[PDB]
Each structure stands twice: as structure tokens, then as C-alpha cells.
Amino acid sequence: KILLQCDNLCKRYQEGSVQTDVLHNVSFSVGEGEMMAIVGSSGSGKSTLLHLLGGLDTPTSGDVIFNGQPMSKLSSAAKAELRNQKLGFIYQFHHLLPDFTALENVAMPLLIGKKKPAEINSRALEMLKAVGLDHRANHRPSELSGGERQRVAIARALVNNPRLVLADEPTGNLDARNADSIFQLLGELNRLQGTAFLVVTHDLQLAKRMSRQLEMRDGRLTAELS
Amino acid sequence: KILLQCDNLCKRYQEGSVQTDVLHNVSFSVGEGEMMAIVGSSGSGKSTLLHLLGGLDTPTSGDVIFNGQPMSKLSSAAKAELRNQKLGFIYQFHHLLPDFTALENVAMPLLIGKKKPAEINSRALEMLKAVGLDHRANHRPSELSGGERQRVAIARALVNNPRLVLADEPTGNLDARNADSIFQLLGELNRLQGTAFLVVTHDLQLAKRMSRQLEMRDGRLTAELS
Amino acid sequence: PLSLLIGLRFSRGRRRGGMVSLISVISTIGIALGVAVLIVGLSAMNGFERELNNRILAVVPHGEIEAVDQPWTNWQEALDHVQKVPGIAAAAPYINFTGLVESGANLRAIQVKGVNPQQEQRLSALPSFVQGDAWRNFKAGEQQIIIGKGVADALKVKQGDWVSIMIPNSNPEHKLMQPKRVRLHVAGILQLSGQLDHSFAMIPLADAQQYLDMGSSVSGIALKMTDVFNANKLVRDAGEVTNSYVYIKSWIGTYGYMYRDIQMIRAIMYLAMVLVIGVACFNIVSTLVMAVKDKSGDIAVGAKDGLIRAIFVWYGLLAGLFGSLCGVIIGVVVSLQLTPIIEWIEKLIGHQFLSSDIYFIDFLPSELHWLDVFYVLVTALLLSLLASWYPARRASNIDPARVLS
Amino acid sequence: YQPVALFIGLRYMRGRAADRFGRFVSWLSTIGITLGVMALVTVLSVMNGFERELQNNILGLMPQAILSSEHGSLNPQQLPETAVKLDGVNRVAPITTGDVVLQSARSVAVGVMLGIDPAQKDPLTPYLVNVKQTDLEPGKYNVILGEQLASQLGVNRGDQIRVMVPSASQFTPMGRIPSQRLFNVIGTFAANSEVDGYEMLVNIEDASRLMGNITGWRLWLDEPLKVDSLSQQKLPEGSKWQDWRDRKGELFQAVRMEKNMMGLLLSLIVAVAAFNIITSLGLMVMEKQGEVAILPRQIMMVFMVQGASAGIIGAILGAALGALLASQLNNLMPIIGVLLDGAALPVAIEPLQVIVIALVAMAIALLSTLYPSWRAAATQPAEALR
Ligand SMILES: Nc1ncnc2c1ncn2[C@@H]1O[C@H](COP(=O)(O)OP(=O)(O)NP(=O)(O)O)[C@@H](O)[C@H]1O
Ligand SMILES: Nc1ncnc2c1ncn2[C@@H]1O[C@H](COP(=O)(O)OP(=O)(O)NP(=O)(O)O)[C@@H](O)[C@H]1O
Ligand SMILES: [Mg+2]
């Protein structure tokens, strides 16, 4: 089977009293166990479609079918029941709170997910130990380094073992030395149990490590054009 | 030449009833016309020394002599005189005002400088031409994109023509396709009137365009040791 | 005459970043809820205090100078001694009567007093509450008497009819005489509310001189001083030129509870109607700690400290001064023409609560007092300058450990 | 940790800044509840203390209009105590009310008579000084004087007085000769009220006014405000309802208007602090996007405890603070200045009122939370900042 399908998505904005349409009928598909790369320009379309497949806005233009169910007749309360198993969100602007605990920040999507009390101190530590960050447990995000708290937010959505991770530039603040150290850990998760994810970038030299390259400009995509 | 002088600088900080920090025996000296780069690890202390020579730290041990005057033998109400005329602020997590436009955010030294009323729309739009963003002027910062609003904060400090532009990962959101077009722009102000700036990083491949490489290993630095 | 701290700081107050107008209508109404009802609470207490000095204090004299059960014959010289002292302005004599009335087979107690018609408007506001066309017809010669409305509610008398008022027959020898019957007519009625309307009656002074058969003698001397609170110390030091015995009796007794609730309720408004501003001033502080990040003055930025505080004391005046001038428009429509609105309180509540045992039923009062409308507006805005000064003092030394300039 | 995931996700959301200024502003909602209760159990305590003195002075000086007769007098045989049946009555007693004058040896004074029963209960019984309740024998006609009457008369113990009635006088062919009998004095009662001035005590069985019967039976009502509304009650043949001279009829409305006018004003300091919850939760909707929002009815129920966190501590702290100042207003050293009354302050703290008034300040912290919490679930996640 094929996981994600999308067509006829004419997104239109209303703020500003001016036509700012940037999306149209994008024909994209997401496979299982296959990683792609949304090579979009700096400002073309690669933030609206990033929030549209996760079910965060209703454009009233088409259908976003996902694993057999659509996002049309989903209510405001019944949406969060389906975002626990097959969804995952990774931000790039670091939307985190600087007054929490660093060990409790990765253990936050485990209390409301009906988990065991002894399972909180087990699954939240095995992800930070494999990445090599274990000496910054009882600290605040106001005190963490520039590349320390950036690697925390990558492993935040990887605590419930999802099937689709929505990310954009994981190597934002971290350099190329910390890039391939964490790109391998994203590769073992696809080979042990199978985790399909997409990485939204702009550079062309970074996307050659993956196996599926699709370039996009203003929602238009036909082939590998440059 | 000389402009910067410092000797026997030491920082004290308390972390859980124990006086522990990460900084020991720093030694930096900048000139006029030359640029340098500082490579530090995630947890080495590069941002602590970055807020130290900019007049935002009271370590009460050493002294930072800039422009022939110290940073500690003055009242607290006159410490902000060397912060916009001869000092820049470039960081990876830019803190922009979300309740104003992009033209008012880049003209921050122009409003507080008590300048002419016909000078506000004279140099703010000129710096956006160099970065190539004219169609994203009278909009909200939420309307600005991820990879382009990082470049907006680059032209925010380069308005009042400072002497020392302090950088902290300028290539955090934009990719390498737009990094080489903006790295030629920082080298143009040194040939126009003469300026010096330090650009810290962690990767050495994009730092090959720097005329001086002085990496940092937890505060201490002697030579090219990797 | 635009200065440097008010001209280049006007564009920073206007902001628009999404969900702003939904929270901008909270601080300007929260600062207006304590001022729009402040002109109502200051008018309700002063409106009831105005009725205390009009129908209670203005109708009862204060100074009492009498003799040893004897008509004071030489009262002309008593008016010359205490007239121009520092504290007593004017004085007028009066003679009390202890007679009863008998009209229409109705019995009611009455305490008729003798007021001079030409010495009643200079020291008391008693004949200034007439509901007729004029009150200058009350004179002597035709035996007129003005009574209250409380007599007509029990004796069913009418204004213009003849009644029978009995007077005690006086005699210089102590014996028993026949009771006298004097037929008088009502030439106007005075209105009070419920307290002194059934015990007072006014006859002229020349009619009082013919009843007791005296030539130039009165019994008591009434006066009124400046203050209304000091009544137990000003009368005691005003009888050193008269004889050694006067009826010294201050106005204290069974009507004590009507004075305690006008002086201590005003005293507790300094901790209640000032505290409502003290809770409402927390609204302008919460937006300052909200705007302590991303603001010119808390960021890195030869001026003095007034440049940083110029954006903090002007944001409080954008919602505080606009809220005070808005609450006075909706505050005058509830203190003059009020309507009952408390009717839908126990209809749609789901589960029944608030088991009543004994309470009171609200109604509509009647008052008119409008003088504290500008003095209450200036004292509600000066403390907002100090309410933003204390966050402005702590907004100069902040370590940028979490925020990057 | 905690076994429930409801009280743990809000402990670090009430100020975790290491400074001397930003830490105290997180507990600014605690001050608005602690000072809201302080201005709540103070004014209502001194208002009920002033109303308590009104009940002690009322129903202890004179009765009101009870019975009347349009055909003359009333006979006790045709109208016993079991025939009349009214609401609010608990005990009946005979009474004779009539204004009479006094012919003393110094001056003349007018007062009303009180035909009490010596074998029954009297309201002036604790105010009896040097007198017994059973001293009004039929044939002696003992008169008990007061304080204000003897100040201008000087009637000592063992003085014969002469009481005359101006109304009960037979129409003689030569003038009008009133009725008068011989009297004596036995003592002086003290009550410190209006009854000591012009109210005398006489026997019920007397022939100085009429005839032998009584005028009626007095009663005591539980509330003197509803006398004008209960005047439309049934009446048997031989009775008539009289006007009760409403001194406290509409004046009681003016002294209870401050409970309804200032009470709506005093209900706003707990409503001004209700907007303090919205300005302390309106910035929480943009920071919750990232932890419990992007990553069902109990998800929005995390702010109902933090929105009521100032309602639990601030109520138990303001109750001890409000009772410390309301019970001792003039007891402590006055630092404000001049004391206006400074003497004999009555207090009234009801135990049945402090339980109900503690629920009003508690329920406002839960009902003012649902409207900001409604904008956290129905609103789209990625629209506030990004
Ligand atoms: N309130 C708004 N009113 C009108 N247009 C808006 C508004 N918010 C966003 N937009 C538009 O929607 C776009 C959202 O970014 P989009 O181009 O769809 O992705 P992207 O910018 O390429 N990804 P990235 O560069 O990482 O931010 C903005 O560039 C605007 O053109
Ligand atoms: N005001 C302060 N002065 C000194 N040390 C501080 C201060 N605040 C926090 N620290 C500690 O000093 C360190 C701050 O450095 P950190 O946030 O880890 O980044 P960094 O490694 O020093 N440089 P960078 O990687 O660019 O963020 C932490 O160990 C903090 O606990
Ligand atoms: Mg950094």
C-alpha cells in the first residue's frame, strides 16, 4: 500500500486583504520506510504543506487522505486521538519553554499518553544515551548550549516511535560534525522497526545522502530542474 | 594600532549551591581590518565570552579595555553607549518584535538615535536591497519565512556602521546556496570604510573564507590543535 | 512644543500582531471598573450624608441656654454677649411647649416649639422645605400654625380647617386650674420622611408671648456653630458670661446608631474604595513583564534614565487615562437613572444552591450629588505613574543568558 | 513523581526565574485573592455589627398598633386570647395606652401609661431597680418614675402626685372637669432609653379613665418592617387596624441600601481579579503550543488548577488576615491618624456566613478559566507564532 496521498490543495490566506496564494494541486506521495527531501526555495512553499499534512488548517479545497482516514470530518477534540501513533512534529524555531527540566522536557509526551509511571524514567533516557548527551539531565534550557538544546528537540517527538516525522532543517544550529553523528541514528530506526520520515531542506549537497530527491518551487514540481 | 585589551579574565557562577562555571584563562585580541573565527564545542564556553566583551557580563575578576576605556569603571546608566555605535549583535536565535513590521525592526538604531525625520525611510530600505528582500517589507514577522528572516537580522545591526560586529552562527536557517552570496557581502564593508568582525562557528568547511582561524578548546587556545 | 520624549515615542504604542485586540480590551476596562463605580460610591455616601444635615441636623438646634425653671426676662443682654465669638455665628431664642392636641377623636403625642418667623432662616434650614408656592405668609396676628405631615396621617386633618390644641394652664402659685382650649387653623404643612414629622409644630413668637401672659421674657436660647462633630466641648465653654446654672445636655441618646454608620463607613472606604484601584493596578504591571522581552529599553540599545521610563509611563496612560474618561460616561447613567436588572439569578443554574435563611431585598434609592467628578479623576491617574516606576527600576540590569540581543 | 498526570504539569509554570523582580510578579494573582478576601470579611463584619445594635434597641421600649374599637372599648369575655390568631405572635399580654398629664409640685410633664400585668412577663423586667414586678395592687395605684422625669420635678421616695387625663372627661354642664385620683411612688427604674423619659408604669385594673375592661392584648412581632404589608390581614367583628407610625418603615430601606449598593461595588474586587486570571492565562496559550498541544476533555483541564492556584492559598491566607483586622480595628496602635469613634465598637462574625462567603471567592477561579481555556483547543495550533 501507499501511505500518504494529496491532490488539489489550493490554500488561500485571508489576512491582509490581498491574494497571497502560494499552494495549488501538488501531487506528492510518501512511502513506507523511504526517506525523501522537500527541496523548496527560501520562501516558496515549504512551511504551509509542512503543517497541512499534520492536520493543522482546513483550506476547504480538496482532500488530505492519510492511512485510510481523511481530515475532513474530524472535530477539535477527536483530532488528538490519532496524533499519538502515526504523527510527529519537529520544529526549527525551537518552540520550547526555558523554565522546565531538561530530563522532563523529553519525558513530557509520555504522561498524557497513558503510560506506566516506571516507564517515564526508562524510555526518556535510552534516547539521550545513544546520542551521547547524558551530563545535562538536571538543567534548564536557559543554561544549555547552542547545540545542546537543539539536539534535545530532535529526540522529543521520537519517544512514542511514530511512523511519520515532520521535520525541517535538523542541522540548523549544529554543525556537520554533529550532523552525521545523528543522521546515523535516524537510519538505524528505519532498519530495526521501520520509521519513514521526510527532511525539508534547501541545499543540494546534503540531500544526496538520501535516496529520493524532489525539488519544488512555489508548489510546482515536475522533475529534477535547476 | 590596537583596540581591544584584556588580561586575567575569570568567570564565577553558581550551579546548585556549588560555584561552578565553564570558563578559564581566556585571551582574545582583535584588530582593525582583519577578521577571525572561533570554533568551540557544545559546552566549551563560546557564548559566555561573547556576552563578556560586549558589556553584558560582570565577572569582577579581569578587565576588558575597548576603545581606550574599561568596561567596569563607569556607572551602570552609561554602559549602553558602546553598544550600537561601535558594537553589533548577531545571534542564531534572533529575538525580533512580533508586533511591528520588518522595516521598523531593521531601523532600531535609527529611531533611538534622535536622527532626522527624513532619514528613517532612507537607510532601512537600502540595507534590504543588499540582501534582496523588497517584497517582504510591510509584513508581520510571522509572515516572514524561516530561511529569510534570519537574513533580516543580519542587516539589522549593519545600519549605524559599527566597528565590531559580534556574530553567533549567522548560517543557521539559510542553506549553503545563499550562504556564499552573503559571505561576499560581509567582505565588502571592510574594503569600503574598514571594519572588523568575528564569526564563531563549529564547522571548518564553510569557515575557509576567513583570514584567521583561532579555535577554542574550553577557553584555552595556543595553536592549530585538533 | 513637542519635546524629545513625547514626539519620537508615539509609534511604539500602536501595535498589531494578531491576538492583540482581544487582550487590549482587558486592561482598559479593568482599570475602568474601579473608577466608573467610584463616582457612584462617593455620591451614595455623600447623598445620605446630605440628608443627615438637612432634615435631622438642620431642624434640631445645638446650643441650649436655659434658667432654673424660670422665664429668662433679661434675654436682650444675653444676645449681645455671645454673638461675635470665634465659633458661634448667630443665635435665636425659643420657648418649648408641652401641650397636647385633640382633633377628630385621635390621640397622638406632640412637642410644639416656638420659632420666630424672622429668626429662622439665618441659622436653620427648617422652613426651607415647604412644598407650597410661598412660605412668607407665616406670621403672627391671625394665630397660624404649621404642623408636619405625620399629624395628618393619624388625625386625618386637612390644610385649611380648624383644629383644637390644648395648652397647659400656667400659674405662679402651685395649684390646679382649668385646662385651656385654643382653636387654631392649619395654614400649611411641612414634609419630613418618617422620624420628626409627628412631634414638631411651629407657632410664631408673638403668639407665644400671649399664651403664657409674659411681657418680654423667653425660656431658652438656641444657636448653631460651624462644625457638626464637636458638640460636647464647644457648648461647655460658652456659658461663662451667663448664670451658673444652664440646661447642659448634648444631643446624644437613643438616636446613636444613625450617626455611627456615617463616620465609620466613610473611614473604611479608605481601605475598600482605594483597594479597588490597588487590585486594578496589577493589570498594567502584567503587561510590562509580558513586554520585558523585545523592547527598546530592555535590550542592549548620553541620555539619562528618563529615556527608558518614557515608554513605560506612557503605556499606562494609553489605557489608564482612556479608561477613566470612558468610565465617567457609563458611570453617570447608573447614578442618576438606574433600573433593576437583578431578576435572572435562580432560573438557569442547573443545580439549586444558596439556601436562603434571612436576607434583604434591593430597591432603587434617590440621591443627587455631583461635585467629585474631577478631583476623583486626577487621584486615580497619579498613582499609575508610581505603579510603572517600580517595574522600570528593575528593568535596567538584566543578564542576557536566555535572551540573545 | 506523582501517580496522576494533572498536578505535575503545572508546578513549574508559576515562575522559575532567578531574580528579585520577576519571581514576585508570578504570585501577583495571589495578592489579588488575599486582599480581595481581606476587603470582604471586614466591611460585612462591621455592617452586621452596626445592625446588631439596631435589634437590641428595638422591641424593648414600646409596642405598636395592635387592636382598636370603633364602638367604644373592648370586652375580654367576647374576645379571648384563643379567638384572635395572627402570624408572628408568640405571647399576648394586656395593655392600656393613653396620654396623661402630671400635676407635680415643681413643674408639669406629660407621659403615656403602661397597663402591664404583675403576674405575667414584662419586657422591662431586667431594668427593675428597687421595685418588684408584683407591686401593682388594685386599690393602691403605684407609679414608677424614671430618670428624665425626676430631673425637672424632684419627686423623691414618699411623695404624693396627681395624674390627670385630658381626654377622658365627662361633659359637665359647667365647664369640663377631668377625672383624677390619688397616687404614690415606690421606686425608680433605669433602662437608658426613651422609656425612662415619658413612660410611666400603672396597674391594669384602674378606674381613672373608663368605667371594667381592658383595651386589648399587645404582641411582639419578629420583624417590624413587614407591619405595613401585614395590615391587610383578617380581623374579627369589633377590631380595627391602626397606623403603626412607620419611623423604621422607609428609613430601614435607607440603612439597608448600603448592603445592596456597596455590596455590588464590593463584588467587583473579586471581579477585577477575574480579569487578572485572563491576563495571566492569555500568554499561556502561546507557550503551551509545543508540549501538550501539537504533540480529550482533560487536556484543557490543566489550566483549571493553575487558574485556581491563587484561589486556594489566597483564601486561607486572607481569612486569617481579614479576621485579624476586622476583630481588632481600634485595638491596635492607629498609624493612620485620628480615630473618629474610638469607643465601643460592636463586631459580628457569623460562623454560618464564613462558609458561604468562602465559596464565592473559590468558584470565581474555576468559572473564569473556561473562557480562556476554550481558545486553547478549538483554535488551530500553528497560527499564533508559526
Ligand atoms: N497572515 C498571513 N497573511 C498572508 N499571507 C501569509 C500569512 N502568513 C503567512 N503567509 C504567506 O504564507 C507563506 C508561508 O511560507 P511558505 O512559502 O508557504 O513556506 P516557506 O516559507 O517556503 N518555508 P520557510 O522558508 O522555512 O518559512 C509566507 O511566505 C507568506 O507568503
Ligand atoms: N550569567 C551567567 N554567567 C556565567 N555562567 C552562566 C550564566 N548563566 C548560566 N551560566 C552557565 O554557563 C554555561 C553557559 O554556556 P552554555 O549555555 O552551555 O553555552 P556555551 O556552551 O557556553 N556556548 P554555546 O555552545 O554557543 O551556547 C552553562 O553551564 C550555564 O549553567
Ligand atoms: Mg550560540
Ligand SMILES: [Mg+2]
Ligand atoms: Mg522552515
